[PDB]
Design a protein around this ligand. Structure first.
Ligand SMILES: *Cc1c(COP(=O)(O)O)cnc(C)c1O
Ligand SMILES: *Cc1c(COP(=O)(O)O)cnc(C)c1O
Lengths: 420, 419
């Protein structure tokens, strides 16, 4: 039982490591070919099925999760001179969506355990220009929506949920996406309910918001089955149309969602139960009165547990990454820096001439504090992506737990590697 | 034959009317299935195949033709405080692409025969803010690229070709898209080389421009090395779907076979209609070929003794009589782009941006662009049906319908003159 990093046998054999995601069945292939030969509407069918399944008043299918967010901002009257508060830790799309609607993104620090935007820090970053908050259900964990909605009601702000990483997740038993003014979902191939490529869904209880998004996704036009296209546009629109084939594929995926979801919940629970026993390993958790979608598993590692009183947390992160990967556990980072460090948000050039920042006069150094929690989380955390999403990954996650337990049984070697 | 409108048999029987487009063959189905099962990559493959067929230095596959246009503007440094000259007759995406990049679209009138940006009207509308021109190869007719490129080079402007309606068309033997600084194509299901849904291609000879669009389509990231999520500037999700890319690769393999049939079929169709007095068939301008994406016909009221009457009256009469024969005659654009609410209201993203950067204003509804209005007033279009390589016999039935209607000028005049 020598470490694989030093010639030992890997806890995960090479021929056991591959996982297919999306999980393509013959029903998926048939759905795509049927959509191709049907020559049409799978998009409105997906809209109805998603709204029905998750109890939303309205669902508008769009090209991408990013387009869902930007069309949501447009529909809620967010634009030039407006600030949108988003988390300092997220996928870059959350920070770009405001820029796409010519609004200025304002970065709030996150919670050290939930990894979601800290409502206390949101309050500290509100100005007279604040128009909206994009809470992200990051990694599949629902954000503090009671606090976010309370802040929004106080200051008259719009709330758009970025639920891209949290399909099926609940907050006080409510489907995520239906709590804010609108909710954004991504059907990107890597996501928990994927399409065969790109896709987005905007959900809302507000008929007028839905209609705005419906027009915005198709050049501002009104498009109806049986009615000849007149090319009359009623406002600023884009090409944010979903592909029918991708819609048909996701409809097929939805018929297995409940079974896939049960397997993930059971498999992830068993995996984290074993890792939670390892000292200096913090398994990801759902906050109280929420359920986690487990899109990404982020683990925080404490140098204290390996007697590394002096060692930078990044050194332990590096050491654990090398050792776990050698055993065949594909441990990754998800985001190397807080979004505020990204060149686009530092240079503040945007479209050109500093727009949208030029409108608010936020062209010079960023207002408010640094984001030490976002930085601390990145400094000491590794992630598992994709492999745990597959319903038959039970045995694979058992071997992952073997690898973790094996690495933790060599604490002297971890401390040595962290030393260099 | 007696007119269908007055109880005769239609020139086009209903069982001949339906045309499948895109034309889906087993090779398309296998390409799509292989793309699902595939899990080097179909997007990269299409980029190479498209660049190779049309002789472009660089091809960047993107979500849509609209995204190809807006990313091209971004790459050429067009943005806030800039103006972009576009034609007053086009698909709205041509006018929207500048707004999408926070620039102001400036509409120039079109030529009464070519329906393309009139270089005589471009020169008038250049200001200190003009940064670019987007000539459209509208309906498949290459624009006057001699005069548009000359104007641009004389004034230090960028040229982006909107070639969405003209794949395979040439200007002085040069593939359209490759003449400007950059060229945009649409692979939308209705286009001459379609995908099974949405798709776009940006082509250019400039490596730096291609790299800008490559980053712009994927959140500003460099993708090949594990994904590090490092963004180098303002980006979007303008990624093409691999499945749509694979489908278009299959279509592109058959493109010139379809071109050969399509070009023969349309030429024979237009030769028959060209004989009918007061009917102007569409034409390729000198030193160009036509892709025939859309066939736009202009009708002269003088030919029907309606010299006094609104051309729209004749347009409506001909549309009614030809549709009764089974010819799906349509309009393509009911108004010049500058009459569209987005360009009239100048609200844009909100607070009048992008117009607010400069305090730039535009024309009110109905104010300008008389030729675009004149063309809309007296023209009907054929869309889709003539694109299919097997539509030879169908277009001959359409020609039978036109000849029937033109053999009854008194009945055309009566309908045109009626309340
Ligand atoms: C994937 C994702 C998005 C954007 O989705 P796309 O469909 O890729 O545009 C936005 N936010 C988060 C948190 C995501 O994970
Ligand atoms: C179709 C088209 C576009 C835009 O293409 P999409 O792929 O639909 O975004 C732009 N210009 C012209 C002339 C077009 O015909």
């Amino acid at each position: 039982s020598k470490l694989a990093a030093f010639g030992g046998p890997p806890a995960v054999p090479r021929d056991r490591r591959h996982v297919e995601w999306p999980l393509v069945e013959d029903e998926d292939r048939k759905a795509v070919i049927d959509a191709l030969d049907g020559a049409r509407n799978p998009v409105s069918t997906l809209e109805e099925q998603w709204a029905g399944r998750f109890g939303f008043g309205h669902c508008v299918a769009v090209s991408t999760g990013t387009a869902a967010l930007s069309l949501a901002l447009a529909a809620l009257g967010v634009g030039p001179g407006d600030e949108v508060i988003v988390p300092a830790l997220s996928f870059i799309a959350t920070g770009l969506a405001p820029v796409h609607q010519m609004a200025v993104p304002v970065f709030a620090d996150v919670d050290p355990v939930t990894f979601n935007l800290d409502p206390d820090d949101v309050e500290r970053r509100i100005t007279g220009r604040t128009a909206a908050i994009i809470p992200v259900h990051l990694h599949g964990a629902p954000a503090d929506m009671d606090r976010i909605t309370a802040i929004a009601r106080r200051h008259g702000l719009a709330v758009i949920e970025d639920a891209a990483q949290a399909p099926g997740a609940t907050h006080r038993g409510r489907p995520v996406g239906g709590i804010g003014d609108a909710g954004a979902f991504s059907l990107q191939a890597t996501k928990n309910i994927p399409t065969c490529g790109e896709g987005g869904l905007l959900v809302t209880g507000n008929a007028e918001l839905a209609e705005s998004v419906r027009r915005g996704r198709q050049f501002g036009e009104v498009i109806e089955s049986g009615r000849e296209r007149d090319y009359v546009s009623y406002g600023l629109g884009w090409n944010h149309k979903m592909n029918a084939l991708q819609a048909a594929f996701t409809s097929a995926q939805l018929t297995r969602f409940d079974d896939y979801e049960s397997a993930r919940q059971r498999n992830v629970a068993a995996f984290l139960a074993r890792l939670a026993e390892l000292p200096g390993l913090r398994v990801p958790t759902a906050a109280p009165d929420t359920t986690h979608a487990w899109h990404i598993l982020r683990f925080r590692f404490d140098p204290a547990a390996f007697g590394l009183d002096g060692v930078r947390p990044q050194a332990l992160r590096s050491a654990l990454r090398r050792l776990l990967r050698a055993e065949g556990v594909p441990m990754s980072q998800y985001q190397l820096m807080p979004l505020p460090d990204q060149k686009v948000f530092v240079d503040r050039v945007g479209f050109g001439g500093g727009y949208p920042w030029t409108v608010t006069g936020a062209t010079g150094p960023a207002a408010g504090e640094d984001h030490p929690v976002a930085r601390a989380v990145i400094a000491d955390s590794l992630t598992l992506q994709k492999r745990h999403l597959h319903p038959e990954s039970g045995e694979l996650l058992h071997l992952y737990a073997d690898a973790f337990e094996k690495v933790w049984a060599n604490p002297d070697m971890v401390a040595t590697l962290a030393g260099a």
